[PDB]
Amino acid sequence: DVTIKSDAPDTLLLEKHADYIASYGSKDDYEYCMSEYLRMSGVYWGLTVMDLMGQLHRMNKEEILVFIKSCQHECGGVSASIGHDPHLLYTLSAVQILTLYDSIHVINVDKVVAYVQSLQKEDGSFAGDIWGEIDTRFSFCAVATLALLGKLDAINVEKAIEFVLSCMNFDGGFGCRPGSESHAGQIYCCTGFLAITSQLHQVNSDLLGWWLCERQLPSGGLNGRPEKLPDVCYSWWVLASLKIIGRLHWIDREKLRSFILACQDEETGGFADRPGDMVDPFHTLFGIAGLSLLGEEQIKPVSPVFCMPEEVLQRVNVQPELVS
Amino acid sequence: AKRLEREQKLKLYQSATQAVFQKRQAGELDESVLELTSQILGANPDFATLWNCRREVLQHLETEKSPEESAALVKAELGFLESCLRVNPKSYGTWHHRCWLLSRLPEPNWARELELCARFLEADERNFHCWDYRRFVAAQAAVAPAEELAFTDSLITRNFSNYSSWHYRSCLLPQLHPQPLPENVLLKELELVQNAFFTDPNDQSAWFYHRWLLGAGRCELSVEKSTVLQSELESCKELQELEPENKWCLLTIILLMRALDPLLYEKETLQYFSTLKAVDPMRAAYLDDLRSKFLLENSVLKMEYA
Numbered sequence: 001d002v003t004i005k006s007d008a009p010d011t012l013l014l015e016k017h018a019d020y021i022a023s024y025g026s027k028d029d030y031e032y033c034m035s036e037y038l039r040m041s042g043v044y045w046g047l048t049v050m051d052l053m054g055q056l057h058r059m060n061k062e063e064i065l066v067f068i069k070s071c072q073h074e075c076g077g078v079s080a081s082i083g084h085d086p087h088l089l090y091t092l093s094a095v096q097i098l099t100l101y102d103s104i105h106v107i108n109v110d111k112v113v114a115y116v117q118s119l120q121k122e123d124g125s126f127a128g129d130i131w132g133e134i135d136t137r138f139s140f141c142a143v144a145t146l147a148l149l150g151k152l153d154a155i156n157v158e159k160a161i162e163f164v165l166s167c168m169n170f171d172g173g174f175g176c177r178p179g180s181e182s183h184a185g186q187i188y189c190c191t192g193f194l195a196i197t198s199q200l201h202q203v204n205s206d207l208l209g210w211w212l213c214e215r216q217l218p219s220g221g222l223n224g225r226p227e228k229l230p231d232v233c234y235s236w237w238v239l240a241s242l243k244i245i246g247r248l249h250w251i252d253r254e255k256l257r258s259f260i261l262a263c264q265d266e267e268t269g270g271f272a273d274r275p276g277d278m279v280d281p282f283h284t285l286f287g288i289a290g291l292s293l294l295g296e297e298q299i300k301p302v303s304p305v306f307c308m309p310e311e312v313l314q315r316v317n318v319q320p321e322l323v324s
Numbered sequence: 325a326k327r328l329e330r331e332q333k334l335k336l337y338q339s340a341t342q343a344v345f346q347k348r349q350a351g352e353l354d355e356s357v358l359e360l361t362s363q364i365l366g367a368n369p370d371f372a373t374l375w376n377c378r379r380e381v382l383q384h385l386e387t388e389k390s391p392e393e394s395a396a397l398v399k400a401e402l403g404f405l406e407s408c409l410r411v412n413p414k415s416y417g418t419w420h421h422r423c424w425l426l427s428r429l430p431e432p433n434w435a436r437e438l439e440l441c442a443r444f445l446e447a448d449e450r451n452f453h454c455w456d457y458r459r460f461v462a463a464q465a466a467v468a469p470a471e472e473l474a475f476t477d478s479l480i481t482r483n484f485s486n487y488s489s490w491h492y493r494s495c496l497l498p499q500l501h502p503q504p505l506p507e508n509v510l511l512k513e514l515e516l517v518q519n520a521f522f523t524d525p526n527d528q529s530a531w532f533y534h535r536w537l538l539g540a541g542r543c544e545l546s547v548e549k550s551t552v553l554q555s556e557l558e559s560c561k562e563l564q565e566l567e568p569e570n571k572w573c574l575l576t577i578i579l580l581m582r583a584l585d586p587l588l589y590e591k592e593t594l595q596y597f598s599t600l601k602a603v604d605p606m607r608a609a610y611l612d613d614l615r616s617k618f619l620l621e622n623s624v625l626k627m628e629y630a
């Protein structure tokens with residue numbers, strides 16, 4: 001079960017992609033308005049890919065800093081958009097943007113810390129928000145937020161680690177919660193988490209690495225779990241996860257690059273889900289990131305853990321050791 | 325035509341969204357908000373803030389209404405949730421809403437929730453949200469790991485796409501025998517698994533589970549386990565004869581020989597890696613690293629000599 005691939009693009013089109021992201025959001029558009037519930041993360045994706053392509057300056061810094069500030073609530077969490085509700089997901093994204101722009105002081109950093117700390121449970125897990133949903137995704141959002149802010153000690157780190165290790169499975173992988181099946185997305189979040197907290201020694205790298213490299217299909221794309229179709233975003237999580245645990249060479253890299261490039265729209269710019277499907281900023285980020293992790297020299301090197309330029313992270317003195 | 329139906333919905337979406345927020349800042353936690361959110365959440369259950377609003381109105385209304393009236397309110401929430409789940413079965417917010425709802429009631433019907441799960445799992449045997457919902461309900465109803473196990477068996481024989489079901493067995497077996505895998509249990513699981521992979525040799529899911537089982541138990545090899553593994557080895561070669569492009573039975577042959585006797589089977593193991601790399605060239609780097617790790621183990625074993 002894979003995509004048979006047609007006569008798709010085989011060339012890197014930085015050009016169109018930048019044009020696509022600088023113009024995305026000009027305001028009557030349909031999928032734009034339907035996406036308001038994730039706008040903050042939408043803005044993170046746009047800013048990051050542009051910066052990785054060296055075109056951050058074509059985006060509107062001052063405008064975004066107001067927006068962010070207007071999305072922090074009295075609890076200190078940040079929402080996706082104005083009037084929407086605070087959540088760990090949009091708090092991480094705002095901090096990534098503020099770190100991209102060197103402007104963390106645009107929000108009340110003490111209140112962000114308190115907010116993240118208030119979402120931790122007795123067993124070490126994190127809820128996403130006051131409504132209580134538990135997911136190792138939110139373990140990743142909490143520790144990644146705090147690390148960017150230098151405040152990782154604000155949470156109970158040992159109980160947080162314990163919970164994540166309790167979500168490890170027979171195949172080496174990780175799920176949402178205890179007992180949940182392994183999935184590429186959850187693996188990325190958990191290996192990221194273990195990276196930030198210096199616990200990669202607890203991962204069975206050979207076992208998990210095998211599971212991850214078996215995600216690559218004969219088309220060259222990676223899927224997020226068995227029996228699934230490959231795509232660009234699961235291609236980024238799998239690869240990033242492999243890089244974190246020192247096993248990126250267990251994939252056929254030239255076949256992955258080609259899949260990723262077959263995913264560009266030659267006419268509109270941006271990347272899609274999979275070849276010839278409709279483009280979006282989410283897959284545009286993760287395609288450019290994927291290509292950067294495979295080595296492409298037109299793209300700035302990208303952190304597998306934080307999905308941001310390394311040169312940004314070198315500046316804030318946060319750079320987790322990975323396996324080899 | 326294309327633009328006709330497209331624009332038309334987007335007007336009515338923006339009006340509804342607009343009115344809900346207006347209502348909310350105005351403090352109007354009433355049935356009008358459930359009606360407006362009903363409209364938006366059906367098309368887009370990933371709009372989390374609106375699940376929040378619904379909880380907010382229900383919490384409030386419970387304090388202005390008779391238990392009968394709020395009973396009625398939760399039953400309509402349950403039906404609303406199911407109609408949303410039919411449309412988009414994989415939305416985190418919809419499934420989280422349902423647990424919030426059920427966790428809160430005086431006397432939920434958990435047997436009927438387990439059956440909602442059996443229904444969605446017959447639609448989509450791989451749906452991870454439904455499997456997580458099922459484990460949640462099993463817990464709340466204090467369902468024994470023994471019957472969850474009987475349920476997993478049914479799902480595997482009746483049809484394939486079983487990764488989800490073997491995974492659940494990986495977690496249920498250890499619960500049947502609390503330790504800080506018994507050989508009898510292990511031998512049983514080995515027989516079920518090889519069954520499965522000599523039935524659909526291209527189902528990758530039983531092979532993954534199998535490799536775990538090969539680990540899960542040396543030579544403390546009993547004659548029975550010794551004879552069972554030797555038999556599994558001969559069966560994989562026969563399957564190899566039939567399916568020469570089958571990469572999974574080739575790895576398993578290697579892994580089985582490791583489990584049996586690394587040094588006795590050194591030549592064959594080496595033979596099998598070249599064959600395997602030729603059928604699965606995308607894993608050539610993985611296979612070289614595995615073969616290097618094993619040749620190193622073979623070096624340590626040969627040293628322990630006289």
Ligand SMILES: CN(C(=O)[C@H](Cc1c[nH]cn1)NC(=O)OCc1ccccc1)[C@@H](Cc1ccccc1)C(=O)N[C@@H](Cc1ccc(O)cc1)C(=O)O
Pocket residue numbers: 038041089092137184185186188189282414
């Ligand atoms: C939940 N999800 C996502 O893609 C979401 C998208 C989102 C919406 N709002 C904010 N993000 N990602 C997510 O929840 O965050 C995890 C995360 C956050 C930061 C850094 C790494 C991972 C994935 C699964 C997943 C699980 C764990 C980690 C990562 C992904 C998902 O359900 N995808 C769906 C459809 C989909 C596809 C794209 C989206 O943006 C949202 C949903 C599918 O493929 O069927």
Ligand SMILES: [Ca+2]
Pocket residue numbers: 056057058059060061
């Ligand atoms: Ca600018």
Ligand SMILES: [Zn+2]
Pocket residue numbers: 231232233234273283
């Ligand atoms: Zn995708």
